[PDB]
Structures are given as structure tokens and as C-alpha cells.
Design a protein around this ligand. Structure first.
Ligand SMILES: NS(=O)(=O)c1ccc(CCNC(=O)Nc2ccc(I)cc2)cc1
Ligand SMILES: NS(=O)(=O)c1ccc(CCNC(=O)Nc2ccc(I)cc2)cc1
Ligand SMILES: CC(=O)N[C@@H]1[C@@H](O)[C@H](O)[C@@H](CO)O[C@H]1O
Ligand SMILES: CC(=O)N[C@@H]1[C@@H](O)[C@H](O)[C@@H](CO)O[C@H]1O
Ligand SMILES: CC(=O)N[C@@H]1[C@@H](O)[C@H](O)[C@@H](CO)O[C@H]1O
Ligand SMILES: CC(=O)N[C@@H]1[C@@H](O)[C@H](O)[C@@H](CO)O[C@H]1O
Ligand SMILES: CC(=O)N[C@@H]1[C@@H](O)[C@H](O)[C@@H](CO)O[C@H]1O
Ligand SMILES: [Zn+2]
Ligand SMILES: [Zn+2]
Lengths: 277, 277
């Protein structure tokens, strides 16, 4: 029993209902403050790349709290080091948005909320042979945060929804929890090409939904990808699960967490990356 | 004499008034066509970098056709090959925009116009000792095209105007031609980090104003940087020169040229770059 909008099970109760680890002091999301962060020139461009000979289908689910794309095993990867050796394997991508265009993102950048934040979830295949082995273990996960911003004038083909192949038109009011649907594959390499993959915040944090496990290497790109008002409204037609008070899915984001709450026993640092320039 | 808006001296006449080289078959701008272009994986990330020992001031001028930033010598460089060895030295940056938000750019991407296109102009210092030696000679110049798009919700610090330092407030009704003003330096490395510097069109073309010299290596970034309506209307406050029919500066773009007019003696190819995938 957790929710976003039911005050009985809502984000204010997670620290009490899931003490391991929603009561911790390495929580996400955080305010990404450009002025307090440390520039680390050794942090390299992110690459996302696909196994050519992967064949299996991708699905999307209304899980009752978000829209979640489920990727097949052994097909999408992240490299942080310029080597294409399958250190990080993408599992899923899901979305957080607002009831209105001025909020939705989990992370903020200098206090600014975006209308939509996508989370590309990977496990550290370098160490862990399966996602179920990685999800609960130290240093198991690496998530990429993709900010989206609304523009009035754009060609479909230059929007993030082109990389998503419009979720194969699956997003509507009848896409009810816990239904899944097979979809055309997401071109995650095209998605990343829509922003500057050298320019990001980096820190150690947590899952943003219970149990808020403190095993996430976070990368949040500073430059947003672009969508239209019509595209954001496609997410807002989804219905929330029945444990929610609100009917239409929206405001599915966790409140901002401090980088270093007062009970921390070892402070964390927010880092930032920029291009060899 | 030439203009944009006086039908006597406007772009339809340049081929007759400046046949060297506005009558050529390697003219710019062009429609940048994603489908028709050749992906060339050898084309690398663009880097812009500064001589940190440079002290000289930058100025901006209303030249009667555009707002033109004049950089000091030996200060800003482009590398296309990852070596920081001063092959390309930046001379100036100017802008093309529309009377309205749905046009202004010189290049189109699959037929789409942006409200504002910036042109970072450099000379091939690898071969030519000065801008005045390169500007009229073969292979002398390389220009970077930066598309700008209007968003409603954004912090000043994530807009292109942060890189421009608002041009020190010089964009207003009283900035009459041919006035020049000292401005804060433009952070061109920050500007380039606002988009994906690996994702671009590449072709051989021309200056877009008389005498349309065919000595320009063009790079046009596909992802736009972001601005506000308030920021685009600052450009629209500039007065046109007395050679123009319109009073306020706007629609200062050249019409689209063909990649290969029917009279070409040697076809050119449109290339496209994307990140080491
Ligand atoms: N919002 S967020 O990015 O901080 C975030 C919150 C919660 C989660 C939970 C992990 N879920 C998951 O991927 N489990 C899964 C389980 C078994 C298999 I085998 C494959 C997948 C992930 C990310
Ligand atoms: N629209 S466009 O990008 O195709 C374009 C059109 C026309 C030109 C003009 C060439 N002159 C010049 O660079 N200015 C200048 C300033 C200071 C010095 I020292 C030397 C020369 C450049 C670019
Ligand atoms: C190369 C890699 O990492 N993974 C896989 C390979 O193991 C698998 O057998 C093949 C067919 O699904 O697709 C790819
Ligand atoms: C990932 C997942 O749970 N997929 C389900 C599948 O098992 C089910 O049989 C089908 C029919 O409604 O729809 C979806
Ligand atoms: C052009 C170049 O590569 N480096 C210049 C150097 O020549 C010059 O003496 C110095 C002081 O202005 O600024 C920098
Ligand atoms: C909110 C905005 O657009 N710009 C702000 C401006 O309001 C503020 O007064 C100044 C702070 O020094 O600059 C920045
Ligand atoms: C360095 C500088 O001049 N910054 C100002 C900024 O503070 C202001 O908020 C903005 C809009 O008014 O224009 C610019
Ligand atoms: Zn998430
Ligand atoms: Zn120009």
C-alpha cells in the first residue's frame, strides 16, 4: 500500500511504512543546484547502445503509479566509460508528470520543475547477472533522468515522442492498471541525441518509490528533450490505480529530499559533468 | 546596395547585382533533409574553446541587416578533430529572425523554420593568417548554425541568453545602425553545451548575404537551444538600415536555395553526423 495522492499511503508516510530505506539520508530526488555542485572533468559522455541481434518485443504497462516501458533482457545498454562491453543493462523506462505543465519532474534544477521526467533504469551487469539480483543489492542500479519541456512549434520527428514511436498509440483512458501492451521498440539512442549527453548532474541516491533503496547511481541531463502540449496530455488520460484518491494519473512524483539531512554519518557530494571543451 | 525587404535590392535580385557569387550553384541556405542526407560516422563532435590568456573586449553592432557580435582576434576557436591546435578561429556571430515566431531561420530542417538562427563565423587559420585573407579565398570559412526555439516555461540560466549575457542589454529600439557597443564576452562553450554538438548537418556552401562567396564549410546543429518570447522580441526592437523598406529589423533571412540547381557542374552531397553510438 503506497500511493502519491492518498494521504493514508502518500509520500509523507513512506518514511514510516518503509523505514528500509525511505527513512535514509541518501534519498532521491534532490534539488540539483548548479552553484553548490562540484564539476568533475573525468565524468565522460553517456552512450546508450543496442544489441543488433536482439529480437524480443518491448511492452508498456499502466502499473497504477506510472507508465513503465519494460525492455527485453540483453538488448539496451549504457556506457559511462566509452567502452561498449555491457556494464549497464537497461531494464525499464518510466515517467513522472504533473496535473499541470508547471510541475511533474522528481528532480528540480535550481528549483525549476519540468512537466515530465523519464527514468531509464539499468542494472550493473558488470557485477550482477540479473536485475532481480541487482535491484536489492549495493551499487546495483544506475538511472538516467531525462527532463522534457513543452514547445508550441516543432515537427513530430524532432520531439521525444518520435524516439518513443508515440508508444505505438497505446496511451488512452482504457489503458487501465495493471494492463500491459506490446509496442514498437523505443529508439533510446535517438532520445539521447535530442539532448547533450556530456552535460549532467551525478550523485549517489535512491529509488524514488518505496522501498527507496539507496543503491542508485544517478545521472540527470541538464538539457531537456522537447514535447508538445498534446503529447503531455496523452499521459494525463491514464487512470490511477484504485489505492489513489485522484482518478487521472498525474502528480506521480516524490517530494524533494535534502542532499545531506542532519542525521547523515557521511555527507554526499553532488557532481556535474560537461564536455571536453 | 542590398536589402532583405526592398524589392529593388532584395534577395531575388542578388544573382544579378552580385553574380560573383550569388549566381552560383553552391549557395546557402538549403533545406536540411534528414532522409536525403548521407550519415558520415567519421564526422566528430564539435568543440568550441577559448584562449584563457585573451584579455580583449567583444563588441556588438547594428550593421543595418543584423545584430553582429565581433570577437577579438586569437580568442575563440573551433575544433572539428578533437585537437585544440587553433585550426579554426572565430571572428563574429550574427543572427537572423522573423517578424513572427513561425519563421526567421535561414536553414530549414525537413521544411521547418525556427524563430532565430545564429551564425558563428570562423576562418581556417590552419591555412590563412588572417580573417581578411580567408574571407574571399577558397575553403577560407567555416560557419556554425545554431537554431533557437521559444519555450513558455524556463529559467533565464537555461536559455541561450545566459551564454549571451543578454548582449549586456544592447538589444532595444535605440540601438540604431551603425552603432557598436562593448558587451560582456559571449560564453560560446556554454552555448554549445545547450545542444548536442555531435548531431549536425554538414555541407559545402556559401555566405547567405552578398557577395554569397562559395567558401563556407557549413555545420548546422539539429537540436535547438532555448529562448523565451520576451528574448526574441528584444531582436525585433532593433531598427533596420535606411536601405530597407521595413522599419523594424525582422525577416532578415535569405530564401532557401537548392542543394543542386539544374545548372550545377558537380553535385554536392548533404552530410549528417551523430554521436559515437
Ligand atoms: N523512479 S525510480 O527511477 O527511482 C525507480 C523506482 C523504483 C524502481 C523499482 C525497481 N523495479 C524494477 O525495475 N524491477 C523489476 C523487477 C524484476 C525484474 I527481472 C525486472 C524489473 C525502479 C526505479
Ligand atoms: N550569414 S553568413 O553566416 O552566411 C555570413 C555572411 C556574411 C559574412 C561577412 C564576412 N565578414 C566578416 O566575417 N566580418 C568581418 C568582421 C571583422 C573582421 I577582423 C573581418 C571581417 C559572414 C557570414
Ligand atoms: C550480445 C549480448 O550482450 N547479448 C545478446 C546475446 O547474448 C543473445 O544470445 C542475442 C540474441 O538474443 O542478442 C544479443
Ligand atoms: C508483462 C505481463 O504481465 N503481461 C501480460 C500477459 O501475461 C497477459 O496474459 C496478457 C493478456 O491480458 O497481457 C499482459
Ligand atoms: C592565438 C593563440 O593561440 N594564443 C594567443 C596568444 O597568441 C596571445 O599572445 C595571447 C595574448 O593576447 O592570447 C592567446
Ligand atoms: C526571473 C528572471 O527571468 N530573471 C531574474 C530577474 O528577475 C532578477 O531580477 C535578476 C536577479 O539578479 O536576474 C534573474
Ligand atoms: C548577467 C545579466 O545581465 N543577467 C540578466 C538577468 O539577471 C535578467 O534576469 C534577465 C532578464 O531580465 O536578463 C539578463
Ligand atoms: Zn522514476
Ligand atoms: Zn548569417
Amino acid at each position: 500500500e503506497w500511493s502519491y495522492t492518498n494521504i493514508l499511503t502518500g509520500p509523507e508516510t513512506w518514511h514510516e511504512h518503509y523505514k528500509n530505506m525511505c527513512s535514509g539520508y541518501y534519498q532521491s530526488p534532490i534539488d540539483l543546484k548548479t552553484d553548490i555542485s562540484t564539476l568533475d572533468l573525468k565524468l565522460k559522455t553517456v552512450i546508450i547502445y543496442r544489441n543488433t541481434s536482439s529480437t524480443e518485443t518491448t511492452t508498456i504497462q499502466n502499473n497504477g503509479h506510472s507508465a513503465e516501458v519494460k525492455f527485453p533482457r540483453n538488448t539496451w545498454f549504457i556506457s559511462f566509460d566509452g567502452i561498449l562491453d555491457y556494464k549497464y543493462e537497461i531494464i525499464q523506462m518510466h515517467f513522472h508528470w504533473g496535473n499541470t505543465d508547471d510541475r511533474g519532474s522528481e528532480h528540480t534544477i535550481d528549483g525549476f520543475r519540468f512537466p515530465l521526467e523519464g527514468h531509464i533504469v539499468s542494472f550493473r551487469r558488470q557485477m550482477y547477472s540479473s536485475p532481480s539480483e541487482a535491484i536489492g543489492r549495493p551499487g546495483g542500479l544506475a538511472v538516467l533522468g531525462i527532463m522534457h519541456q513543452i514547445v508550441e512549434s516543432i515537427k513530430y520527428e524532432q520531439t521525444a515522442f518520435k524516439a518513443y514511436n508515440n508508444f505505438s498509440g497505446v496511451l488512452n483512458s482504457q489503458f487501465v492498471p495493471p494492463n500491459n501492451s506490446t509496442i514498437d521498440d523505443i529508439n533510446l539512442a535517438l532520445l539521447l541525441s535530442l539532448l547533450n549527453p556530456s552535460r549532467y548532474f551525478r550523485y549517489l541516491g535512491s529509488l524514488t518509490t518505496p522501498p527507496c533503496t539507496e543503491n542508485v547511481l544517478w545521472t540527470v541531463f541538464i538539457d531537456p528533450v522537447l514535447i508538445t502540449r498534446e503529447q503531455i496530455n496523452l499521459f494525463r488520460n491514464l487512470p490511477y490505480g484504485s489505492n489513489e484518491k485522484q482518478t487521472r494519473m498525474g502528480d506521480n512524483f516524490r517530494p524533494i529530499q535534502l542532499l545531506n539531512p542532519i542525521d547523515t554519518l557521511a555527507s554526499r557530494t553532488l557532481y556535474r559533468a560537461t564536455a571536453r571543451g
